[PDB]
Structure formats: C-alpha cells, structure tokens
Amino acid sequence: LIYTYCGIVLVAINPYEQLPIYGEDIINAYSGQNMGDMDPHIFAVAEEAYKQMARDERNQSIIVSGESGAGKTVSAKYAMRYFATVSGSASEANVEEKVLASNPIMESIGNAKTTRNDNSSRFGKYIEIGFDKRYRIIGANMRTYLLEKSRVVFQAEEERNYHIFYQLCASAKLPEFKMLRLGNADSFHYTK
C-alpha cells in the first residue's frame, strides 16, 4: 500500500510503478463517501474537498510537499483527472485535457533533470480550478513562484538545464526549425 492517513494528512510512497488503483471505476466508487471510510487515497481528499464545497461553500486548497516531482506531479494529475471525471462537462473536460497535456510543456520549460529526480520540479506551481453555482468547473488559472535562476545558465554534473532546451536541440532536424540553425544539445553551452 502507498497511501496512509496521518491525522488529516495523507502520506504516500513513490512506488515507481503504474498500479491500477487509479481506475475511474475506483474514482466513482470513492464518490459520495465519508472521509476515511474507504482506504486512503487522494480520491478521498478530493471527495472531501467537494464535501467541503457542499457544506461551507468556501474555496478549497490541496498542498503537496516533499520530493520534487516524485509523487507530487503524478498525484496532482490524478486529482485533476478525478475532478474532470466528476464534473463531466464536455468543454470543461477538454479544458482539463488541455491542462494535462500542457503539464509537459511547463515541465520542459520549468523543470529539469536532477540527482534527486530526472523529472524534478524546479519551481513552485499553483493551479486554480473555478466552479460555478452548480459546483461544476468553468475555468482554470496558472500561477508560478520562485523559479530557479542558476539553472538557466548553470547546470550541475549529471544535471541538465530545463528540458525544453534539450527537447528542441534533439528536434532541430525538423524543417520548420532549420533556419534556427540549431545543432545538438552538446553544440550549446547551456546544455552541455
């Protein structure tokens, strides 16, 4: 098991595997359930967030801390998927699909390989998801804080610059990038 209640806190362990515990069947099973009655899962805290919306009607916050991009990003993506599945608004569901597909772009432009993690968050991210009177999603909002400065120009041993640099360097063979005169990653001082 990865999840465990620690008071109100939830604790997880990075399993490095894709366990099927994230099936949408399990997601709808978690729907309409009291806190802690099921086994621990972030689906439970998401359901508790919706229950708090029903009761107090005040905005919710879910905070993840610990290792950078170990279980944080994947858990946040699971939470987003849970919210999209519960709301079930076609245009809005497309909105969270865009958000999820974009998460790689901010990973490329704001995250980099480190000794701790090859996909490690190098900046503080904050994502707001709006809600109408129907408690349905209507929009999203991005906010960033404390981006690393040295990473742009300095890269430690076995540590890369922002993933976008290497991604564009390896993809420099595309015709539309040809006039960019971009070589491989080793051809530039910000990536070698």
Binding site: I8, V9, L10, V11, A12, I13, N14, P15, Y16, E17, I42, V45, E48, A49, Q52, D56, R58, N59, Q60, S61, I62, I63, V64, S65, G66, E67, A70, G71, K72, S75, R116, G124, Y126, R143, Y145
Partner: peptide, 24 residues
C-alpha cells in the same frame, strides 16, 4: 500565496521517496 491559502481551506499530502536507487 499565503493570503490565497488562508482565504481557502487546505488539505495536505506528502510523498516519501523509499530509496535512492528508485527501483520499484
């Protein structure tokens, strides 16, 4: 961000890396 958090109700989740070698 502190004011934003205080204006909302928070929930807390933490992940622990089991080993440095990262094998499952």
């Amino acid at each position: 961000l502190m004011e934003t958090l205080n204006a909302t109700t928070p929930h807390y989740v933490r992940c622990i890396k089991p080993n440095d070698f990262k094998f499952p």
